[PDB]
Curated annotation (Swiss-Prot):
One of its GO terms (cellular component) is nucleus. The active site is at C47. This is Phospholipid hydroperoxide glutathione peroxidase GPX4. It comes from the Eukaryota. Essential antioxidant peroxidase that directly reduces phospholipid hydroperoxide even if they are incorporated in membranes and lipoproteins. Can also reduce cholesterol hydroperoxide and thymine hydroperoxide. Plays a key role in protecting cells from oxidative damage by preventing membrane lipid peroxidation. Required to prevent cells from ferroptosis, a non-apoptotic cell death resulting from an iron-dependent accumulation of lipid reactive oxygen species. It comes from Homo sapiens.
Amino acid sequence: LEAASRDDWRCARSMHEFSAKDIDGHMVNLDKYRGFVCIVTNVASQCGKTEVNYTQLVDLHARYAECGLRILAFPCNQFGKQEPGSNEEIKEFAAGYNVKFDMFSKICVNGDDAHPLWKWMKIQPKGKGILGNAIKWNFTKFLIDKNGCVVKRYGPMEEPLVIEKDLPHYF
Ligand SMILES: *C(=O)c1cc2c(OC)cccc2[nH]1
Ligand SMILES: *C(=O)c1cc2c(OC)cccc2[nH]1
Protein backbone atom coordinates (compact mmCIF):
# COMPACT_ATOMS: atom_id res chain seq x y z
CA LEU A 1 0.00 0.00 0.00
CA GLU A 2 0.89 3.68 -0.18
CA ALA A 3 0.26 4.41 3.51
CA ALA A 4 1.94 1.09 4.44
CA SER A 5 5.43 2.64 4.09
CA ARG A 6 4.70 6.30 4.86
CA ASP A 7 3.03 5.43 8.20
CA ASP A 8 5.49 2.51 8.47
CA TRP A 9 6.32 3.37 12.09
CA ARG A 10 2.74 2.33 12.97
CA CYS A 11 3.57 -1.35 12.33
CA ALA A 12 6.87 -1.46 14.20
CA ARG A 13 6.98 -4.42 16.59
CA SER A 14 8.99 -2.93 19.48
CA MET A 15 11.17 -0.04 20.59
CA HIS A 16 14.16 -2.07 19.35
CA GLU A 17 13.22 -1.25 15.73
CA PHE A 18 14.04 2.45 16.13
CA SER A 19 17.20 4.55 16.28
CA ALA A 20 17.87 7.98 17.78
CA LYS A 21 20.78 10.37 18.13
CA ASP A 22 22.35 10.51 21.57
CA ILE A 23 22.95 13.90 23.15
CA ASP A 24 26.44 13.96 21.59
CA GLY A 25 24.95 13.60 18.08
CA HIS A 26 25.85 9.91 17.55
CA MET A 27 23.14 7.64 16.18
CA VAL A 28 22.11 4.91 18.63
CA ASN A 29 20.40 1.68 17.56
CA LEU A 30 17.77 1.12 20.24
CA ASP A 31 17.98 -2.65 19.71
CA LYS A 32 20.88 -2.45 22.17
CA TYR A 33 18.26 -2.08 24.93
CA ARG A 34 16.92 -5.57 24.25
CA GLY A 35 17.05 -7.55 27.49
CA PHE A 36 16.75 -4.38 29.58
CA VAL A 37 13.75 -2.77 31.27
CA CYS A 38 13.62 0.83 30.13
CA ILE A 39 11.99 4.06 31.21
CA VAL A 40 11.63 6.42 28.24
CA THR A 41 10.84 10.00 29.19
CA ASN A 42 10.72 13.51 27.71
CA VAL A 43 12.74 15.92 29.84
CA ALA A 44 13.07 19.69 30.26
CA SER A 45 15.44 21.87 32.27
CA GLN A 46 13.18 24.80 33.24
CA CYS A 47 10.05 23.00 34.46
CA GLY A 48 8.73 23.26 38.00
CA LYS A 49 9.15 19.48 38.25
CA THR A 50 12.63 19.33 36.69
CA GLU A 51 14.40 18.85 40.03
CA VAL A 52 12.10 16.11 41.33
CA ASN A 53 12.20 14.16 38.06
CA TYR A 54 15.97 14.29 37.55
CA THR A 55 16.72 13.44 41.19
CA GLN A 56 14.32 10.49 41.32
CA LEU A 57 15.43 9.15 37.93
CA VAL A 58 19.01 9.22 39.26
CA ASP A 59 17.75 7.42 42.39
CA LEU A 60 16.03 4.74 40.29
CA HIS A 61 19.06 4.19 38.08
CA ALA A 62 21.33 3.95 41.12
CA ARG A 63 19.06 1.35 42.74
CA TYR A 64 18.22 -0.86 39.75
CA ALA A 65 20.86 -0.47 37.01
CA GLU A 66 22.40 -3.81 38.03
CA CYS A 67 18.91 -5.34 37.77
CA GLY A 68 18.70 -4.23 34.13
CA LEU A 69 17.02 -0.84 34.41
CA ARG A 70 17.95 1.70 31.74
CA ILE A 71 16.61 5.23 31.34
CA LEU A 72 16.38 7.07 28.00
CA ALA A 73 15.86 10.82 28.42
CA PHE A 74 14.69 12.84 25.40
CA PRO A 75 14.89 16.63 25.77
CA CYS A 76 11.88 18.41 24.27
CA ASN A 77 11.04 22.10 24.00
CA GLN A 78 7.36 21.68 23.06
CA PHE A 79 5.86 22.29 26.54
CA GLY A 80 6.11 25.87 27.75
CA LYS A 81 9.44 26.24 25.89
CA GLN A 82 11.04 24.75 28.98
CA GLU A 83 14.03 23.15 27.18
CA PRO A 84 15.42 26.07 25.15
CA GLY A 85 19.14 25.25 25.44
CA SER A 86 21.38 23.41 23.02
CA ASN A 87 22.14 19.69 23.38
CA GLU A 88 25.55 20.55 24.83
CA GLU A 89 23.99 22.80 27.46
CA ILE A 90 21.38 20.15 28.30
CA LYS A 91 24.15 17.56 28.68
CA GLU A 92 25.96 19.85 31.14
CA PHE A 93 22.73 20.52 33.04
CA ALA A 94 22.19 16.76 33.43
CA ALA A 95 25.77 16.31 34.65
CA GLY A 96 24.91 18.64 37.54
CA TYR A 97 22.43 16.01 38.74
CA ASN A 98 25.06 13.24 38.36
CA VAL A 99 23.09 11.60 35.55
CA LYS A 100 24.58 8.25 34.49
CA PHE A 101 21.67 7.07 32.31
CA ASP A 102 21.31 7.75 28.58
CA MET A 103 20.74 11.33 27.38
CA PHE A 104 19.53 11.81 23.80
CA SER A 105 19.48 14.78 21.45
CA LYS A 106 16.48 17.13 21.65
CA ILE A 107 13.39 15.99 19.70
CA CYS A 108 9.73 16.68 19.19
CA VAL A 109 7.31 14.24 20.80
CA ASN A 110 4.03 15.58 19.30
CA GLY A 111 2.99 16.49 15.77
CA ASP A 112 4.14 15.40 12.35
CA ASP A 113 7.85 16.00 13.07
CA ALA A 114 7.86 13.91 16.25
CA HIS A 115 10.54 11.25 16.44
CA PRO A 116 8.88 8.03 15.19
CA LEU A 117 9.73 6.18 18.42
CA TRP A 118 7.44 8.63 20.23
CA LYS A 119 4.79 8.37 17.51
CA TRP A 120 4.90 4.60 17.99
CA MET A 121 4.88 4.54 21.82
CA LYS A 122 1.80 6.77 21.91
CA ILE A 123 -0.31 4.29 19.88
CA GLN A 124 0.63 1.18 21.87
CA PRO A 125 -2.30 -0.36 23.80
CA LYS A 126 -0.59 0.23 27.17
CA GLY A 127 0.76 3.61 26.02
CA LYS A 128 -2.71 5.16 25.79
CA GLY A 129 -3.16 8.64 27.23
CA ILE A 130 -6.15 10.37 28.81
CA LEU A 131 -7.94 12.82 26.50
CA GLY A 132 -6.01 11.43 23.54
CA ASN A 133 -2.60 9.87 23.14
CA ALA A 134 -0.60 13.10 22.70
CA ILE A 135 2.10 13.87 25.26
CA LYS A 136 0.52 16.42 27.61
CA TRP A 137 3.57 18.01 29.29
CA ASN A 138 7.22 17.51 30.22
CA PHE A 139 8.23 14.31 32.03
CA THR A 140 5.77 11.82 30.66
CA LYS A 141 7.18 8.31 31.24
CA PHE A 142 6.79 5.05 29.31
CA LEU A 143 7.86 1.74 30.84
CA ILE A 144 9.31 -0.71 28.28
CA ASP A 145 9.87 -4.40 28.95
CA LYS A 146 12.88 -6.46 27.89
CA ASN A 147 11.24 -7.27 24.55
CA GLY A 148 10.79 -3.58 23.73
CA CYS A 149 7.03 -3.50 24.33
CA VAL A 150 5.28 -0.62 26.05
CA VAL A 151 3.78 -1.90 29.29
CA LYS A 152 2.78 1.27 31.16
CA ARG A 153 2.49 5.04 30.75
CA TYR A 154 2.91 7.56 33.59
CA GLY A 155 1.74 11.16 33.28
CA PRO A 156 3.69 14.37 33.88
CA MET A 157 2.35 14.67 37.45
CA GLU A 158 3.58 11.21 38.50
CA GLU A 159 7.02 11.43 40.09
CA PRO A 160 9.48 8.74 38.89
CA LEU A 161 9.49 6.81 42.19
CA VAL A 162 5.86 5.89 41.44
CA ILE A 163 7.27 3.53 38.77
CA GLU A 164 9.42 1.68 41.32
CA LYS A 165 6.66 -0.65 42.57
CA ASP A 166 6.05 -1.83 38.98
CA LEU A 167 9.67 -2.71 38.17
CA PRO A 168 10.22 -6.09 39.91
CA HIS A 169 7.55 -7.66 37.68
CA TYR A 170 9.64 -6.94 34.56
CA PHE A 171 13.22 -7.53 35.75
C1 LIG B 1 1.80 -0.38 9.24
O1 LIG B 1 2.66 0.38 9.55
C2 LIG B 1 0.46 0.11 8.80
C3 LIG B 1 -0.71 -0.58 8.66
C4 LIG B 1 -1.79 0.22 8.20
C5 LIG B 1 -3.14 0.04 7.89
O2 LIG B 1 -3.69 -1.22 8.04
C6 LIG B 1 -4.91 -1.42 7.41
C7 LIG B 1 -3.89 1.14 7.45
C8 LIG B 1 -3.30 2.40 7.31
C9 LIG B 1 -1.95 2.61 7.60
C10 LIG B 1 -1.19 1.52 8.05
N1 LIG B 1 0.13 1.38 8.41
C1 LIG C 1 18.08 -7.01 40.50
O1 LIG C 1 17.26 -7.44 39.75
C2 LIG C 1 18.21 -7.47 41.92
C3 LIG C 1 17.55 -8.47 42.58
C4 LIG C 1 17.94 -8.65 43.94
C5 LIG C 1 17.61 -9.48 45.02
O2 LIG C 1 16.64 -10.45 44.89
C6 LIG C 1 16.23 -11.04 46.07
C7 LIG C 1 18.29 -9.29 46.23
C8 LIG C 1 19.28 -8.32 46.37
C9 LIG C 1 19.63 -7.48 45.31
C10 LIG C 1 18.97 -7.64 44.09
N1 LIG C 1 19.07 -7.00 42.88
